[PDB]
Amino acid sequence: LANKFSASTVHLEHITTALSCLTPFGSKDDVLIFIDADGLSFVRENNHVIKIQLLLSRELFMSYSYRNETEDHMKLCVKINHILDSVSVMNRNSDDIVECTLSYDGHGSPFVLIFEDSFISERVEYSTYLIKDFDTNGLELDRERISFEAIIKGEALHSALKDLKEIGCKECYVYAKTEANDENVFALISKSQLGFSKIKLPSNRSILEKLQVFDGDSTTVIDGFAVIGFFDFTSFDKIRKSTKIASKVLFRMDVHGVLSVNILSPGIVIEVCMLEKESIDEAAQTEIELLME
Amino acid sequence: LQLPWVEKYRPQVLSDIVGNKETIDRLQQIAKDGNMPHMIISGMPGIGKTTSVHCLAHELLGRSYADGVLELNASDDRGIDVVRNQIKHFAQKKLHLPPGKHKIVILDEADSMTAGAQQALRRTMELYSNSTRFAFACNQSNKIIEPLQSRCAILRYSKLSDEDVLKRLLQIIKLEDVKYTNDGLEAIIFTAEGDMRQAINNLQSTVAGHGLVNADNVFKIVDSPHPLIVKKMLLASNLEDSIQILRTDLWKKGYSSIDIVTTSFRVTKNLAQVKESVRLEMIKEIGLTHMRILEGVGTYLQLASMLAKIHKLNN
Amino acid sequence: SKENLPWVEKYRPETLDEVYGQNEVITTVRKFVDEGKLPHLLFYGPPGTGKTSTIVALAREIYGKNYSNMVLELNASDDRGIDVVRNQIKDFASTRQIFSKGFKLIILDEADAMTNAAQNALRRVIERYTKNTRFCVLANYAHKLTPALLSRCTRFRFQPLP
Amino acid sequence: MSFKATITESGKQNIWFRAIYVLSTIQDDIKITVTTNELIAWSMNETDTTLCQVRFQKSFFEEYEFKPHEIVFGENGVQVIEDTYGNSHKLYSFRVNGRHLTTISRKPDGDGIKSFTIAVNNTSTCPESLANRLIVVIEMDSLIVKEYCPQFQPIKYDPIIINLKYKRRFLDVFGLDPKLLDVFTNTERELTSALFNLTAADEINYICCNSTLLKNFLDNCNVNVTDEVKLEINVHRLSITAFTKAVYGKNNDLLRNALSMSNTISTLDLEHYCLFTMKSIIFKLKDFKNFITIGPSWKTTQDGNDNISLWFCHPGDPILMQMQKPGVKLELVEVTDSNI
Amino acid sequence: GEQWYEKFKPNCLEQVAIHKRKLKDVQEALDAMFLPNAKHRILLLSGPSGCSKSTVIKELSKILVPKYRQNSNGTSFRSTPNEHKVTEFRGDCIVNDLPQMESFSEFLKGARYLVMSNLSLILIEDLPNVFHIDTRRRFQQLILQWLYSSEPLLPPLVICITECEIPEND
Numbered sequence A: 001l002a003n004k005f006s007a008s009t010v011h012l013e014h015i016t017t018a019l020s021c022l023t024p025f026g027s028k029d030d031v032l033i034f035i036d037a038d039g040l041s042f043v044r045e046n047n048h049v050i051k052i053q054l055l056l057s058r059e060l061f062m063s064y065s066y067r068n069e070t071e072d073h074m075k076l077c078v079k080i081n082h083i084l085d086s087v088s089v090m091n092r093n094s095d096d097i098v099e100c101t102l103s104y105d106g107h108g109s110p111f112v113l114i115f116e117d118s119f120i121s122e123r124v125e126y127s128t129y130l131i132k133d134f135d136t137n138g139l140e141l142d143r144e145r146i147s148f149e150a151i152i153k154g155e156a157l158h159s160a161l162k163d164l165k166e167i168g169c170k171e172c173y174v175y176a177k178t179e180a181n182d183e184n185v186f187a188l189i190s191k192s193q194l195g196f197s198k199i200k201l202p203s204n205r206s207i208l209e210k211l212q213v214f215d216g217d218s219t220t221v222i223d224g225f226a227v228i229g230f231f232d233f234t235s236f237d238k239i240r241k242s243t244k245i246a247s248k249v250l251f252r253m254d255v256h257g258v259l260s261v262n263i264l265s266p267g268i269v270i271e272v273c274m275l276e277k278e279s280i281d282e283a284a285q286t287e288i289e290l291l292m293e
Numbered sequence B: 001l002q003l004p005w006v007e008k009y010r011p012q013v014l015s016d017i018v019g020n021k022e023t024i025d026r027l028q029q030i031a032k033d034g035n036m037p038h039m040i041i042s043g044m045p046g047i048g049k050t051t052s053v054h055c056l057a058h059e060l061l062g063r064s065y066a067d068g069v070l071e072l073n074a075s076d077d078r079g080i081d082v083v084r085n086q087i088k089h090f091a092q093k094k095l096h097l098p099p100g101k102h103k104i105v106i107l108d109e110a111d112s113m114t115a116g117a118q119q120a121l122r123r124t125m126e127l128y129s130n131s132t133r134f135a136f137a138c139n140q141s142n143k144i145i146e147p148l149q150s151r152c153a154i155l156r157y158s159k160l161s162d163e164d165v166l167k168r169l170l171q172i173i174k175l176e177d178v179k180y181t182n183d184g185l186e187a188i189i190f191t192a193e194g195d196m197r198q199a200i201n202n203l204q205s206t207v208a209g210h211g212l213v214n215a216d217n218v219f220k221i222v223d224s225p226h227p228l229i230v231k232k233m234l235l236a237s238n239l240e241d242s243i244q245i246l247r248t249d250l251w252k253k254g255y256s257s258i259d260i261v262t263t264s265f266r267v268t269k270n271l272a273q274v275k276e277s278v279r280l281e282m283i284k285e286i287g288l289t290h291m292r293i294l295e296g297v298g299t300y301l302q303l304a305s306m307l308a309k310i311h312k313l314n315n
Numbered sequence C: 001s002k003e004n005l006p007w008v009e010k011y012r013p014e015t016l017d018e019v020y021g022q023n024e025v026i027t028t029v030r031k032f033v034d035e036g037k038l039p040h041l042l043f044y045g046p047p048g049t050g051k052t053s054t055i056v057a058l059a060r061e062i063y064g065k066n067y068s069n070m071v072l073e074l075n076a077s078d079d080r081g082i083d084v085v086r087n088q089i090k091d092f093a094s095t096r097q098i099f100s101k102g103f104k105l106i107i108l109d110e111a112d113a114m115t116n117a118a119q120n121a122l123r124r125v126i127e128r129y130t131k132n133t134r135f136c137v138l139a140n141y142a143h144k145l146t147p148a149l150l151s152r153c154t155r156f157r158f159q160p161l162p
Numbered sequence D: 001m002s003f004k005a006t007i008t009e010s011g012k013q014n015i016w017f018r019a020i021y022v023l024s025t026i027q028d029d030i031k032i033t034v035t036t037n038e039l040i041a042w043s044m045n046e047t048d049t050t051l052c053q054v055r056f057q058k059s060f061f062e063e064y065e066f067k068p069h070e071i072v073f074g075e076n077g078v079q080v081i082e083d084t085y086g087n088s089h090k091l092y093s094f095r096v097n098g099r100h101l102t103t104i105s106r107k108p109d110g111d112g113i114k115s116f117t118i119a120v121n122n123t124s125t126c127p128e129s130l131a132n133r134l135i136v137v138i139e140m141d142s143l144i145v146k147e148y149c150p151q152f153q154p155i156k157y158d159p160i161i162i163n164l165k166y167k168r169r170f171l172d173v174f175g176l177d178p179k180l181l182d183v184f185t186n187t188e189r190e191l192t193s194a195l196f197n198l199t200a201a202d203e204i205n206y207i208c209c210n211s212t213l214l215k216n217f218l219d220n221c222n223v224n225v226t227d228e229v230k231l232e233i234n235v236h237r238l239s240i241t242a243f244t245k246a247v248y249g250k251n252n253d254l255l256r257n258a259l260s261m262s263n264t265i266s267t268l269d270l271e272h273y274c275l276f277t278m279k280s281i282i283f284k285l286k287d288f289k290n291f292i293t294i295g296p297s298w299k300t301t302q303d304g305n306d307n308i309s310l311w312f313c314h315p316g317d318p319i320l321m322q323m324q325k326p327g328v329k330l331e332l333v334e335v336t337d338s339n340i
Numbered sequence E: 001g002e003q004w005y006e007k008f009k010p011n012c013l014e015q016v017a018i019h020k021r022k023l024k025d026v027q028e029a030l031d032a033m034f035l036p037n038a039k040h041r042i043l044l045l046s047g048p049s050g051c052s053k054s055t056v057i058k059e060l061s062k063i064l065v066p067k068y069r070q071n072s073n074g075t076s077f078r079s080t081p082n083e084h085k086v087t088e089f090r091g092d093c094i095v096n097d098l099p100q101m102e103s104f105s106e107f108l109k110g111a112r113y114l115v116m117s118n119l120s121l122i123l124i125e126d127l128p129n130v131f132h133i134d135t136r137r138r139f140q141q142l143i144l145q146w147l148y149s150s151e152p153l154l155p156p157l158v159i160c161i162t163e164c165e166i167p168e169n170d
């Protein structure tokens, strides 16, 4: 096509899955679209405290063309509600849709989405908006100061998130500890109307693939030291829908109070970065210690 | 970093709170005894109500403070559902405490609580008074519904005197080793208008700007309370003097006309010298000028005409 | 880009050195940032005296060129009801800095347009999170600000430009 | 560890959850009494018009352990009851939020439960924070472990003896199909094992009916509209009517619509019927409808008989209802209408 | 710990702080309400805070309920005589299987049964959330239905309302 960017696919599941994953960040707000030869990424942020980035690589599309030469990437901003409503109305006959094509012709042009059926094609153009001064790259994990890392099965984490949601969890605490004899302890401690509750992940290489505590430098492994991260459940729970489709989840917490969750479902990949609370109250610390000891 | 002095020097014990000597002494008596009843603490901003309630709770509950205190303010959810679930469950909790000690529910800024929540609080107070006690903190005691007031001891905090403010300022200065002069402390106290929070903020600002707390240095940053300027403007025996005050001290300093008229109404309400007829006529003229300002004509000429009418009435 | 802008915006001061007329306020705030003891601030003054420009320049000086990542700016064009104070401002003020860059800054421009309930909810948010966050309130009409909010802020008056 | 109990079977977990849920529907707070032989979960509504009680025998739980002499904190819940034979029994009673326990006890949609443990530790070696908290440990089939500690308040236990008195009166009045003799022997044994002991005033009526038909009829009953239930039994049929009376306003305007739906069952179908010589009784339907759904939750094939027993004497007197399972006893007492 | 207003609460009707004429009027009305076919079904007490409405109602009930309750025909929940002379509605109660707005509706549907050998005085002091428009409308409907009910037997229903101004709120 003559457009600067044009990608067409025959798998409508990826698009609807991406919209489903982006929904928990607000049904009425902005979404940033990054386009480059590598692929197309959707980015959303909430309250300068949480961020989600979902990537769609070239392989997911049966055709992918990025003809821009002046710039190696293109940035645009759209309204999530517009896309949601348009797709919901257009995707009513999901059995008949055979092709979906996204297109963009640079700054000043709309983001074009076309659903192509056997004999009927529906073309929608979404108006674009100026991108906010806030930089998505601002909230990122310091790769050189990882406090701890862990690998978890998607099903178990999703079930734990469901349990936390169903009890009205208000505050969440991620507890990670390592000892000798390949002993690992990863747990989520919730403060809710029920009081303090705990969900412990088994120390087996079936759900908790690996856990390591790096002493805040990503290099030296230390045993007997517990890393505790305090988060508001309002932000922590936003990864539930991404975990629903997740095959594996990688948690990485740094010393600056940043938690990164990498979710793997050729495929859809998600990265959620969240900030932790300033400090943990004495009562919460005592209750966590009592629960873990 | 370095905390602002207002929070850095927040009193942590009841013995460090200045002013309201009788009320603070009674709070100390309650703390040493234990039999704390439901209480309401009312007063103007920045006089120590929140600090007093927190210090009393800490002294009463000791190490059990974490499990024996439930604090809620206007920044938290405090609707009827909160009363139905969170406060009810806290009051139902069985906590072993030393004899004469009860759990404490602190409701800061209780005035802002909704009517439904306040009405719901009646039954929980009736049912769980044997193990739980309520401390309301507010600025207007009348904004708490009467059925709740009926169960509590009232405690009204008065404005701090210059002596108490000076004593606390001297303690802070000694702790910080700040160089000052008597006129500077006088200016700080005069500009604080009885608010200790403002006094501390102004002292910190002056120290940061110049270090030495003199009168001129204080008045470079801090401004005399404009209510006093408005009172002087209203009480001037000459029309030209009132106009000169309005021009030099208020208009050219950047004070908005709406603020000037609202302050004029507030001040005229409290003029003890004037007669009732003159006062009510001045109020009428101020109201008419306020109506004109709200419509968009917020000009200096309107305020000058208001002053001319007030002077005419004084004659 | 700047050439096409209206002069009122093309000549907006970028650094505190470009702000004129408010010598006392600029001096004091510059020394406060030099010592890193910034208190909660109130900028009161008439239109077009440099309040918004001054606060933005101070944020730039504190956080350099990356101030947009750790400054939360809200104005009358944004909804700032009690729900907003309870959720968004509360969560921003109660979370860590991006890279442990000292304290965070919340700018409430044209705060005289905020409702009484929101201002009341702001009191304890300002008080409890003072260690990690500092508030700046800008206004032209003081009578719209509740006494509790006024008590909590160090007040600076922007005079009509000499 | 003052008290500890564990449940492993899936059907046992189902019945535990259903009983807790129903009790939670009756009252906001459920009352748990631990003995040396059983755990009793009971609830009574605000108006004192309905009482529900589920007793789990110690054989119900895989592991059961009760050491009242170790209780230090929460001592107000410790009680001693003197038996008629000259024996002292120790009990521990407390109150717990029903909704919280129901949420804790529910089965996750995706993940199953391997074991469900409930424990109380008010012993000397108990941290102050953990005092007066019910420890619940849930092991998942995926080796995931969940822990909860909802607060509880110790209370005193006042046993209800309506069931014992009704059983004694029924035995005296009506005490031949061998099933009737077996029922009489079972009632006599229950009365003897209990810790406590031709005029018209001695009226008593007993009905044993297969609960399946009642549940089928009630499935169409919407308590939100049909708030009353009337049982009318004669020597030929038993009629269950879910009904609601009309209300007329000022000018005879219809403030509330009358409604009624009836179902008839031949006396032959009913397992047993004993009448004091067309008996009628009226009571509330919601609690009965909820209570009829506890026993079936387990669905035990062996000795499987979801039969409900009912006892009633006179209008205004309580109606008693009983259901049984291999290690569970379910009791529901309701207040009947006094008209006529 | 004990509060004096609870420690020294009245132990009998004579110790209640109430004007004699008002007490006489209330007692006559309530006694008439207990009769087999009483004209009045609801007694509505209104007044300012802390004027002995609920206290006098409870003290009067302690005398009236035993005198008018039919002796049970050897039937009762527990061994004790079930001293539940006053049945009060609890506004903060939440159950699993009931919407909030219907809670009061359920209460009355049980309260109707407390007659004859189960006689008890129904007292409404902690009202439902009448500040919610729908809840208030449902409450009014239920009160009207109780007033217009065709049930031959109903227990006395006393509603105590404490009148107070609502301070202006932002």
Ligand SMILES: Nc1ncnc2c1ncn2[C@@H]1O[C@H](COP(=O)(O)OP(=O)(O)OP(O)(O)=S)[C@@H](O)[C@H]1O
Residues within 6 Å of the ligand: B005, B006, B007, B009, B010, B011, B016, B017, B018, B019, B043, B044, B045, B046, B047, B048, B049, B050, B051, B052, B138, B139, B168, B196, B197, C123, C147, C148, C151
């Ligand atoms: N009597 C006092 N003695 C010493 N410091 C005081 C006193 N009153 C206020 N302060 C100082 O100002 C700060 C705030 O005091 P507060 O107790 O919060 O005043 P307040 O009356 O509760 O204000 P409001 O009603 O919440 S606006 C304290 O941390 C102290 O540093």
Ligand SMILES: Nc1ncnc2c1ncn2[C@@H]1O[C@H](COP(=O)(O)OP(=O)(O)OP(O)(O)=S)[C@@H](O)[C@H]1O
Residues within 6 Å of the ligand: C007, C008, C009, C011, C012, C013, C018, C019, C020, C021, C022, C045, C046, C047, C048, C049, C050, C051, C052, C053, C054, C139, C140
């Ligand atoms: N002190 C100043 N020095 C230099 N330029 C100024 C100054 N004040 C205002 N301006 C100019 O006028 C424009 C507006 O300045 P602002 O800082 O936005 O004034 P303001 O006090 O915030 O107005 P309000 O109160 O929001 S109506 C700036 O872009 C500058 O170009």
Ligand SMILES: Nc1ncnc2c1ncn2[C@@H]1O[C@H](COP(=O)(O)OP(=O)(O)OP(O)(O)=S)[C@@H](O)[C@H]1O
Residues within 6 Å of the ligand: B147, B150, E004, E005, E006, E008, E009, E010, E015, E016, E017, E047, E048, E049, E050, E051, E052, E053, E054, E055, E056, E160, E161, E162
């Ligand atoms: N002689 C007394 N007479 C009445 N009440 C007394 C007396 N002595 C102590 N009290 C207590 O004072 C309180 C009386 O207040 P109430 O009976 O509740 O008045 P009220 O009309 O019901 O107002 P509300 O709606 O409860 S705020 C009770 O808690 C009584 O226990």
Ligand SMILES: [Mg+2]
Residues within 6 Å of the ligand: B049, B050, B051, B108, B137
């Ligand atoms: Mg305060």
Ligand SMILES: [Mg+2]
Residues within 6 Å of the ligand: C051, C052, C053, C109, C138
């Ligand atoms: Mg501005």
Ligand SMILES: [Mg+2]
Residues within 6 Å of the ligand: E052, E053, E054, E055
């Ligand atoms: Mg009363």
